[PDB]
Design a protein around this ligand. Structure first.
Ligand SMILES: CC(C)c1cnc(Nc2ccc(S(N)(=O)=O)cc2)s1
Length: 274
C-alpha cells in the first residue's frame, strides 16, 4: 500500500470507498477499493475469473485487518452516461451492443457457477472504444432485486442476474427506472401492479414461499406495449422472457444470445466527455 498514491475519491457503496490511484513502480493508473477467512478464500478465486467483459481484479492486499482490492481503471459508469444522455437518449444500436456484451459476460461467469447478486448501473463501467464491463461482484438499492429474493428464498439461482439486467435494458430505452421502490413491500407491490399479482397459474410453488401472504392485493397484468413503447417487437419479446416470474421458466444468458433481436448486432462507439 506504500506502493500507491491516491489521486481522488471516486465514490462509495455499502462495503467500501473507492479511489483513483497511481502505482509508483509501474507508473500505472488503477482503482482502489477500501473495506474496514472463508471471505479471503472466495475473493481470491475471483483473481482467476478473467474475461473481456469483466473488470479485472489485479490484487488483494490484507494489512492490519483492513482489506484493499486493486482493480483495472475505466473512465465512466453507466449511471453517469445515462444522466448525460437524458435529453437525447442512448441510440438503439448502442443499447443493443451493450446488452449483447453483458450477456456474454454473464454466460461465462454462470458456466463457472459464479453469481454477481448486485447488478445495477453503478456496477457497469464503459470506455472510449465501445466496451462495457461487469464490476465489483458481491459475495442501498432494491430497484433491481428479483422477486424470489424479496419473497424470502435462501437458495436462489443464476436467474436473479437475468432479472436485474432486464430492469437495466428497460431503463436505457425509456430514460426512467422501471420499478423504483422505496421499501421492501413497496418494491414488491410496484412489480405486481405492472406484471400482475403472481399465483399458482403463472408460478407453481409461489404460495409456499416464506414471505408470501394470501392477503396481497390482486392486480391485473399490463401490456408490454405500454411498459417500453419505443422498442420493436423483437426487443419486447426478449424483455418479456428476461422478466418471467418463475425462475425455472426465465431465459438463460446463453439462450438469450441466440434470440433474433441480435441477428443484426454491431459495435458502435459512444460520445464521451471526460
Ligand atoms: C472499483 C472498480 C470496479 C472501478 C474501476 N474503475 C472505476 N472508475 C470510475 C470512473 C468514473 C466514475 S463516475 N461515477 O462515472 O464519475 C465511476 C467509476 S470504479
Amino acid at each position: 500500500m506504500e506502493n500507491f498514491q491516491k489521486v481522488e475519491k471516486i465514490g462509495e457503496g455499502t462495503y467500501g470507498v473507492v479511489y483513483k490511484a497511481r502505482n509508483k513502480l509501474t507508473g500505472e493508473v488503477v482503482a482502489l477499493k477500501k473495506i474496514r477467512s472463508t471471505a479471503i478464500r472466495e475473493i481470491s478465486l475471483l483473481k482467476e475469473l478473467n474475461h473481456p467483459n469483466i473488470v479485472k481484479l489485479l490484487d488483494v492486499i490484507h494489512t492490519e485487518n483492513k482489506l484493499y482490492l486493486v482493480f483495472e481503471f475505466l473512465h465512466q459508469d453507466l449511471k453517469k452516461f445515462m444522466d448525460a444522455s437524458a435529453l437525447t437518449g442512448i441510440p438503439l444500436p448502442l443499447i443493443k451492443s451493450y446488452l449483447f456484451q453483458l450477456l456474454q459476460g454473464l454466460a461465462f461467469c454462470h458456466s463457472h457457477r459464479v453469481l454477481h447478486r448486485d447488478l445495477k448501473p453503478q456496477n457497469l463501467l464503459i470506455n472510449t472504444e465501445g466496451a462495457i464491463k461487469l464490476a465489483d461482484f458481491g459475495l442501498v438499492t432494491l430497484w433491481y432485486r428479483a422477486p424470489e429474493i424479496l419473497l424470502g428464498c435462501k437458495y436462489y439461482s443464476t436467474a436473479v442476474d437475468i432479472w436485474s439486467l432486464g430492469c437495466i435494458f428497460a431503463e436505457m430505452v425509456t430514460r426512467r427506472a422501471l420499478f423504483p421502490g422505496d421499501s421492501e413491500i413497496d418494491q414488491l407491490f410496484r412489480i405486481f401492479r405492472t406484471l400482475g399479482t403472481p399465483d399458482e397459474v403463472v408460478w407453481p410453488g409461489v404460495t409456499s414461499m416464506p414471505d408470501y401472504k394470501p392477503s396481497f392485493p390482486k392486480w391485473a397484468r399490463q401490456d408490454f406495449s405500454k411498459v417500453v413503447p419505443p422498442l420493436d417487437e423483437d426487443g419486447r419479446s426478449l424483455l418479456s422472457q428476461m422478466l418471467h416470474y418463475d425462475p425455472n421458466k426465465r431465459i438463460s444468458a446463453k439462450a438469450a444470445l441466440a434470440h433474433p433481436f441480435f441477428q443484426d448486432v454491431t459495435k458502435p462507439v459512444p460520445h464521451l466527455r471526460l
